Enzyme design. Structure first.
Site, PDB file in Angstrom:
ATOM      1  N   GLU A  41      -1.712   3.368  -8.546  1.00  0.00           N
ATOM      2  CA  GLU A  41      -1.231   2.163  -7.861  1.00  0.00           C
ATOM      3  C   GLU A  41      -2.280   1.875  -6.788  1.00  0.00           C
ATOM      4  OE1 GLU A  41       0.652  -0.164  -8.017  1.00  0.00           O
ATOM      5  OE2 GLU A  41       2.498   0.674  -9.120  1.00  0.00           O
ATOM      6  N   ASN A  72       5.048  -4.604  -2.197  1.00  0.00           N
ATOM      7  CA  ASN A  72       5.037  -5.922  -2.320  1.00  0.00           C
ATOM      8  C   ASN A  72       5.762  -6.885  -1.102  1.00  0.00           C
ATOM      9  OD1 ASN A  72       6.358  -8.740  -3.739  1.00  0.00           O
ATOM     10  ND2 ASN A  72       4.246  -8.308  -4.333  1.00  0.00           N
ATOM     11  N   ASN A  78      -1.018 -11.084  -5.830  1.00  0.00           N
ATOM     12  CA  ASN A  78      -0.427 -11.430  -7.296  1.00  0.00           C
ATOM     13  C   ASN A  78      -0.426 -12.925  -7.573  1.00  0.00           C
ATOM     14  OD1 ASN A  78       0.609  -8.696  -7.877  1.00  0.00           O
ATOM     15  ND2 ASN A  78       1.830  -8.865  -6.217  1.00  0.00           N
ATOM     16  N   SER A  86       2.160 -13.493  -3.594  1.00  0.00           N
ATOM     17  CA  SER A  86       2.696 -12.298  -2.748  1.00  0.00           C
ATOM     18  C   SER A  86       1.546 -11.398  -2.933  1.00  0.00           C
ATOM     19  CB  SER A  86       4.090 -11.705  -3.239  1.00  0.00           C
ATOM     20  OG  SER A  86       3.638 -11.152  -4.460  1.00  0.00           O
ATOM     21  N   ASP A 142      16.855   1.194  -3.836  1.00  0.00           N
ATOM     22  CA  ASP A 142      17.135  -0.181  -4.582  1.00  0.00           C
ATOM     23  C   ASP A 142      18.064  -0.269  -5.902  1.00  0.00           C
ATOM     24  OD1 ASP A 142      17.118  -2.866  -3.465  1.00  0.00           O
ATOM     25  OD2 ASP A 142      15.960  -3.267  -5.188  1.00  0.00           O
ATOM     26  N   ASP A 200       0.426  -6.960  -2.709  1.00  0.00           N
ATOM     27  CA  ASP A 200       0.469  -5.559  -2.721  1.00  0.00           C
ATOM     28  C   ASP A 200      -0.080  -4.956  -1.691  1.00  0.00           C
ATOM     29  OD1 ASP A 200       2.438  -6.295  -4.729  1.00  0.00           O
ATOM     30  OD2 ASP A 200       0.844  -5.800  -6.338  1.00  0.00           O
ATOM     31  N   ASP A 254       2.258 -14.999  -7.865  1.00  0.00           N
ATOM     32  CA  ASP A 254       3.282 -15.620  -7.263  1.00  0.00           C
ATOM     33  C   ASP A 254       2.891 -15.927  -5.911  1.00  0.00           C
ATOM     34  OD1 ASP A 254       3.460 -12.920  -6.403  1.00  0.00           O
ATOM     35  OD2 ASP A 254       5.866 -12.993  -6.775  1.00  0.00           O
TER      36      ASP A 254
END
Length: 129
Positions: free
Chosen positions: A35, A59, A46, A50, A101, A52, A48
């Site tokens: 990562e 995110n 990203n 957003s 989650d 990281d 969209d």
């Protein structure tokens, strides 16, 4: 800070990640490797809009607030910058919420594609833990 492999394993173990939610330590170290390459300062934007953040590339659309992601939910209640610290505590605490989650570690695309189903034990081999 750029962590060494065994240094990170030890910090993560100390922070309660070994076997957290059933995922052995090797899984967490493998995920961090792919990562962020063990770099706490890593960021990636990203499509969209957003971004990281950190060692575990958390995110901004759901987990942290960076002030520039419309509709962010900030479920970990921390500014995204806190995730770039040399002290991994915030990243670890937030990661614990993420993995709980419902989708487990599949939340991390690099884990799913490069760690899942591999001999993750190799990531902590040789370490004094």
């Amino acid at each position: 800070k750029v962590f060494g492999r065994c240094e990170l394993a030890a910090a993560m173990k100390r922070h309660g990640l070994d076997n957290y939610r059933g995922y052995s330590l090797g899984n967490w170290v493998c995920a961090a490797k792919f990562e962020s390459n063990f770099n706490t300062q890593a960021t990636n934007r990203n499509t969209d809009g957003s971004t990281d953040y950190g060692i575990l590339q958390i995110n901004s659309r759901w987990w942290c607030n960076d002030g520039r992601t419309p509709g962010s939910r900030n479920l970990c209640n921390i500014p995204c910058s806190a995730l770039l610290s040399s002290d991994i505590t915030a990243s670890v605490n937030c990661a614990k919420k993420i993995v709980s989650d419902g989708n487990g570690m599949n939340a991390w695309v690099a884990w799913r594609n490069r760690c899942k189903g591999t001999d993750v034990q190799a990531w902590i081999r040789g370490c004094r833990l």
